[model samples]
Target chain A: DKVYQMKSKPRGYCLIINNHNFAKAREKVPKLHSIRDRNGTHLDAGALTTTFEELHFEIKPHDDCTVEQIYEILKIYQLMDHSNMDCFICCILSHGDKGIIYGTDGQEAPIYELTSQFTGLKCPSLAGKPKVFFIQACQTRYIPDEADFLLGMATVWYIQSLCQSLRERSPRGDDILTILTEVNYEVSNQMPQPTFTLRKKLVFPSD
Target chain B: DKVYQMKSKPRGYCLIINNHNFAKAREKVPKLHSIRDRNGTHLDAGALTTTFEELHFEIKPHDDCTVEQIYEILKIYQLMDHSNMDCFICCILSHGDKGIIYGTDGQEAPIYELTSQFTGLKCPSLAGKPKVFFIQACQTRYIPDEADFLLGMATVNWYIQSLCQSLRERSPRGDDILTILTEVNYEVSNKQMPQPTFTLRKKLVFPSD
Candidate 1:
């Protein structure tokens, strides 16, 4: 009924896990042998860092993570005390299908498996706080049975819309869901679908 | 980027298609042989009528329509002139599975099929205006590839959360449709929270009476 409180400076951790070169994945798994490296992804990574940093979020960038490393990074944040923070943001740029995302090792992991690590039960400090997962991978996929999670899908266009919307709207006091609705509008063809289980409006104000 | 201008007196048509008795459906389709009559749906119909009417929308209610009848009703609205209106709303209550809703005749129709009729391309009068489909049924379903449309999915919680007090109270305070729906999710979370998938380019706030 009310908006989520996002008053903490260095609002929270903005984790950008970018899988640019997938040669290791191709070499490690036969299924990924023909997979090509993502060359233009670094731009998206940079865009996200620049955008979130301006919004007062502490940026955490991880490059070329294996499936295990992805798990480890999420676990690190999952276990952290967010008592002083307002929210959490995680952006995963990789190859994916349906409900699975592939790591640099070509190992597949259910998106749910990674997101579940931060459930209020697992991350008590972040209970009732908004946890955003911007999955910049291909999927035709409701995620998150629990509340306060917003799952964004699509690729560069998704990121572009997200960054643009955040820059334009957040300063104006528009909430995250409202910003995402604008993102959903800006993207064409492959739409950036935002599936949110948020109980309240999540706004990041520059005030 | 901007708020949707919903200033029209009769904002637009609020179509309510409620299916209460499944006797015809059970008799028509063997799969629905076990389907029972929706006992309290008329009350839902009444609530919707009162709510939308208060919001300055013209209400059109249809009860126990067959599959063909449902399409015909949508077609009628699709072909109508909405140039003077700012938005369109269609509330449907029936039995449904993933991506499909059943008519009173137990026949199935894709929720997409009904919604597609009012898309900008198909219905030029309502072009760029918001079109909402409140589907009160079961199962999960991303609907609408087009912009300016919202699809709401659930049962009594769906209708009540929307019609109960949220819309009436929040509209005057300038809460947009999406924000109101978010409140509906908040109230109901405590569908399965009511899921609302919208591609509306602007915030849509119903005119306060």
Candidate 2:
């Protein structure tokens, strides 16, 4: 018996960003990299293009651009005419912890600031399409183990010092959640069928 | 004046996979870093993390891990105990294209196959939390414009070839879209409040009343 399969071609686009400054610093200090239990490694930017193929895109790395700069770049891209494209995907590569990514100048930019610019109200080209932004960075520098031990200590000052010291010395990155939230809001507001997919994956299996 | 500001805490994780083979290739072609344009220069692993830090996170890298291995590690981490985390993030750095990522063994693993492991039904720890995966690698080996353009009538073919090559070279690195959708589903199903605030800022304020 033979089986037939029908596949629907969904127009999609992808954007990927991978910041490696945090990884470089960790590399400088052998101790940091040796601390295997902690998070500290660089990503291969090429990995992004390898993952998303259905949607054609232009991949650019803003070496040390801030969230604001990234927003500017994306906004410009949205305005370009890509007649065959139906969706847009943007990925941010940087250091984060909760709601921010490091700009090239060492300052912090909220992730939302960048993504919000591509919504329907901002860039009409991507208004109704699936505007996806994938952020591959840390959200916080605070590790869970630090908090667990501070609870029973009587000396609050001592505990506080310990936490701060650990965090200061620890190697961590930035966060990309807020950027995604803002993108979702702007996209949903202008587009009639605005669907924002954040963080993880959206699977479409081949029969 | 007293300020009553809610300090949004940074929350998320990072997964770094370093394919030795890619690293070796990079070492041979160090000049690739020189290529630049209006966007900026190409980012190495170190540069990628520095930018990630501005957002406030603890970044880590893994050397010599396969695509499947990285997924397995994340699956285990999620299963252990992630009650305190509001979301999860993973990054894969390797040589790849189209639907696959390179493992330490120099084999190919479908981008979807690796990320699907963290779904609600597949991995419970990450069932409802936002799981963000980032890939930094090429999707194909073909580079258009470098080819013969004498057959101008086939400019559309050239465009198609460029598009296909780019997709095959860049898609896997960006294909974590499926994993994200599953995460949203789990969040909606488990939450009492339909809306969950996921942001890239210290404090995300909703403009609604």
Candidate 3:
């Protein structure tokens, strides 16, 4: 059985903001030669950058942007000609908290400040088109899973992007929820404790 | 008609994070800069540091902190017992976009993520005691001052510098305002006559119609 997948032809654009340097004061935040727990983000950035480019997106990379610059860039992109595109992608690679993304100036900016710029009112060109945000930060909130709506989708990282292992299995055709549950089930087995798959009353075949 | 003045006594703590560098990638976002519209923050950071120090805050200065560290530090500070102190001050000096602050790593952290850690529910030790945040960046849209509120509160380095200069001038009797906030350390607005700028809200009781 085959599945609906991201079309091989480029469908949109992906904006990558990868900050790998630190200010003199934030030296404690650690630098990435791929050593610390916070390190290796650059690798992830590299991987994702390659992944999206292959998936057919015009990728523009912004490095170490400031708060003002990020907002400005988003606003500028909002005005772009996305009429021919299918969706939009924003990839933020930084040290993060719950709701903020950092600038190189060692200051923090609000996430809404970035995403809101591409909203229906602000960036009408991209309106109704899927505006995907892939944030590789420490924040454990913002986008959440459907079952986790017990608290609603408070956590930020989307479920589809998180379970990388499920990407292959997912295209095999199933309802969105069932596929996600299967992915979570697979992911849950790998983890010592289950953090994803919500429903427990149902039965399924074991590995 | 001097307003109540902030005594020259050191009280609690002031945490200052000033970032002056960017990753090799953000060359376009401006630099840990000295020139450019986004430049001159060092000027603001420098001035604020000196002013807060003179006001007697045990300044714990951190340069180029990561977004994670910022949140961690705020939570740690929130855990502190402000029972003996008047308040807490966290000053961020970075290139911001909106609703967020950036670490030197060039990653953006949410503004609320940093400050909310000190909220009464999260860091209960500082509850009731004031938790003040001083933001020095270039986003003009967050919280705005009313045009006709008659409150001459505008956020800028020069406006701040002038107010500090006038604090000891307008009413040497402590009638000047040094800056603005819903509440600051007692040293900020703790006493005397209300300087037009330093007008404390308590004095403006609700008037009956």
Candidate 4:
């Protein structure tokens, strides 16, 4: 019996948005704590810093650090001639609120502003591949309870009662991460598989 | 100001694999107490079955109740036309080992076998789009720190332990989820922005989806 095996190999690219310039911020808050091993030997911070630097590069600050920059980068790849690649993945890490993320220059741009660039009418290469995005950042402001509100709400039966009395409320619907995740998952599920022709093998009989 | 909205809505699909025709097996086994929900209610076996049938008209059952049938169904979707979609999501709820998920018939299919279907070469419509798969199954059989191990002698750990050990001991390489996610992020991040063309819109406005 002739055995046929199907294999799938996919390649990916990443863009990390670690906006906190730790090196620059270190001078402002320069209280270095020594990290020691279990044997009480102090570790080399220089070596550790070098290893971290090699693994992840810092994004240089630019005046136009808007979400548009992210879209521009992705568009270049989409326009590029790379027919051999399989799927795509993307991640953004920066200050965010609701459906928006901050660029290096502190400009707020909606997450969709960058992602919507890879539509069928736009970036042709990514028209139908899986494009994943992981966003690591705060999406909203936290409001802590104070004693003034605590006293007024003490008589309330539950948190729902307090909320019902309040006219205003937090925004509803999906967050930026949820939106992107759901979009990627849904889009990939609907893609149609391509067809390929099979190659023939010749055999000679030995008499 | 410009606005960009979702091109399409998102939906999730699940495939379950339970061999032995659990319902039929229940009839045979007198002591059988079928799976129950957190509320102590006998879990509705026909929940997903009924749901899918209502949405898609008909549902097919595998002869042996094998997990391979689920993969086959997923492959069929990828092989079909999908010109009007924005994303894809697949969920597998079955017994699995790390990269392989089991079928209803006790057969196993590699996770890659199902996911790789949405690759550029395989699924053109999903080339530059996002493809996400959520697996709610065990990745390995190894349970950490069981009483079966001897005090001094070391035994081979399961697949999960091997993965962690290899990751810690060796330099990072390709074929990992981290690598995959990172690459996709970078690629999409570097793409160009759509050019906005201005029209004499003081007198007229355009509507779009």
Candidate 5:
């Protein structure tokens, strides 16, 4: 198909993993005790929930999850039947290093390990459908080897611009890439990068 | 600008670095003596030149370039004034690792170093203009930080061929580069799976002049 079919009722599951506090993380890693609590992440999570919900997605929000807990949650979703859905969205807001995200317990979770769970071979239901990941973290990366996957990565000042872009542009039927370009224009201090091997134009039009 | 202005006299330079022989590389890195000479790169280079030239780009084809020679050539373009140019393209067909590509001499050059040379701050003349790179190598990667840059990567097989076919079939219809790349990703999906990363702030289209 030239464009992803994104009009299914309850478009898909929007899994929002918001990591707000670093108290446990700091305690777990003494050397990294300086890891301060995320100041205004609730606002970002709220905006994401409100935005994705309005777009006909079912929101599955998890907060303060450890690295093990993160994998557990992902596996739950990976095993679910998505025969009635049109897409899958996973948003990870946390602290990170070069290629890995730090869980609430100060453990590392490779971004690839998280995304690879939904590869076509792994999750047949989402084989041809777009598996969207919006990562709002410090040092971001991706491992999208399969087709039909799009990853939007940002450092800071990201989720707000991303939410604004989605709220404003998707209504006019702009593709996700075009919306990301607008976010790149609006957000400063390093632009949000999108790495994808998606096979079609992805547009999320709101009713 | 929603669509990049690509109507210059010549759409700009398209540098093609096709590395076919790696005898020196095999000798230098004994552990990698198995590194064989690329056989069908000439066909890929010919198709790339023919396609980009048809789209109004001046072709600069360099064959079998060592790592230093590759940077030397890039520096030449980096220092040039692109005031009249609408875009810049650099296609490297060689052997590569995770985040780097190899010179025919077994030396390594980070892809980031090559692309950073044309950043808006570095090459002010090409600032805000699209800088497109198509890397047809084994293990490709990129470090695209600034706006107006795109990297189309592949691991050989049908990647370059699929790209040429897509550009020829799509550009004349006014499809943006991203859209054309999506088609390429689809065509090459079950075989090799080409990847494209871009921070372009606007849609880029090449006029079929």
Candidate 6:
């Protein structure tokens, strides 16, 4: 009786490369405060992994990703069969300074360059689809590098609120923009003194 | 019953500001070899009104819109109820150079600034909605255009005409935007005019529905 019912459920993809351990830090950065490692960050990825999986995102995660590894994995994702997908999502949790983040390789990667490679235009299969990015960060020596302390904010409300929004809001009719607006509110209110050069948040269609 | 359904169907809004009257040509830019009047442009807006009506767009047409009036009307539309709508479409039929189009007041409006006003961030209600703009004009002496000509493109290469046809052919279905800029020598080859050509043949699915 179950021989052949046609079922074609389309799915999007989300990749999170959480680079917690750098090979080294700059002399100016002064990151000698030894905190528990970034596999702990994996819990963030791990929790979202289950929810995104429920929503049908083919989730691929990498930990302690080197700059090379991040670039290589994204370049591969840019050439996938996303014609059936509705939207793409990704998050990066890292230790970094303004405008650039360090991969385990200790090399800096401009965030926009990484995003452009996977943009709808570059990845034609995903053209006209929403590409959402989440940025979470940490700074040692208690330098308020314009942002959040991974002390619990990221693993706490930020992650939980997103999961709630994703399941309840995303597929139920909320567009990525509206959902993100809500998410931004959640992060900004709970996290202390969050600062970022969000200039590049300007939306570019078909980039 | 059909009339009842028509009354019940929800509709998006469209604003078409077609500037057919130009104040004058630029200094030393000749009072121009008088070309035939582009009254045909009203037909373009008219066809779209009915077509968009079929797709459930409440047609709002403005004629001889001034530069200030254009900006004002767009700024007003920015605060509209787009959550109940699928998308927004605005068209500018005017004469000018690359990157900037004009209105009856001969004002130069940078294309990007006009678009930014209605983008998702600027217009929160319409956030996450598709913002579509259409431009029709002769690129003065050798700028560029997709297909219309006030001459116009040997009977106005009919890009908007094809756009309407494509919408009729594929209304309320496709997810991607599309247009078949079908001119057959279109802008440059047939007319003595040469546009900024670098092979811009992109397959855009006509936007409807």
| Candidate number achieving the greatest DockQ relative to the actual structure | 5
Candidate 6 local lDDT, A114-205, one digit each (tens): 66576435677755344556656554111111110111112115665666766667555443323433453455322311111110111211
Q: What does candidate 4's lDDT look like per residue over B109-173, in tens digits?
A: 76546655665577776544444443334311111111110000011112222222332322123
B186, model 2: CA deviation in Å?
18
lDDT per residue for candidate 6 within B1-209, as digits (tens), equals 00001122344577778777664433212443343335678777787777677776777888877678888898778877676765566777766545566666566776556666764356777653445566665541211121110111111225455556656665555422211222211212223221111101112233343
- For candidate 6, the per-residue lDDT at A53 reads 76
Error of 5 at B45 (Å): 0.9
Using alpha carbons, what is the TM-score of model 4?
A: 0.28
Candidate 3 wrong stretches, greater than 4 Å: A1-9, A24-38, A139-163, A166-207, B1-209
TM-score, chain B, model 3, is 0.61
> Which pairs of residues have clashing backbones in candidate 6?
A146-A195, B149-B152, B152-B156, B177-B205, B178-B204, B178-B205, B178-B206, B179-B204
Model 3's i-RMS, to one decimal, reads 26.8
Candidate 2 overall lDDT versus native: 0.38
List runs of model 1 lying over 4 Å from the truth: A24-36, A65-84, A95-125, A138-141, A184-189, B24-33, B138-141, B155-164
- By lDDT, rank the candidates, best first: 5, 1, 6, 3, 2, 4
Best by TM-score: 5
Determine which window of 10 residues in candidate 5 chain B has minimal summed lDDT: B136-145
lDDT of each: 0.79, 0.38, 0.46, 0.32, 0.84, 0.50
Winning model by lDDT: 5
Q: Which should have the higher TM-score, number 3 or number 6?
A: 6
Model 1, span A1-207: residue lDDT tens: 689889998799999999978888888899778887887889989989989999899999999998999999998999999999999999999887666788888888888798888887899999888998898875322454567887776532778778987888889998877787777667743555566777788888876
Candidate 1, residue A187: the lDDT equals 72
Candidate 4 residue lDDT tens string, A78-111: 5754344433434444544554655544456665
Candidate 4 regions exceeding 4 Å error are A1-207, B1-5, B9-65, B138-209
Candidate 1's displacement at residue B135, Å, is 2.1
Reference-based lDDT, residue A110, model 3: 68
Q: Each candidate's iRMS in angstroms? A: 3.2, 16.6, 26.8, 24.5, 3.0, 21.4
Give the RMSD in angstroms, all C-alphas superposed, for model 6.
14.3
DockQ of all predictions against the true structure, Cα-based:
0.35, 0.05, 0.01, 0.01, 0.58, 0.02
The segments of candidate 6 whose C-alpha lies over 4 angstroms from its true place after superposition are A1-13, A19-44, A55-58, A63-69, A78-162, A168-207, B1-14, B19-44, B51-60, B64-69, B72-209
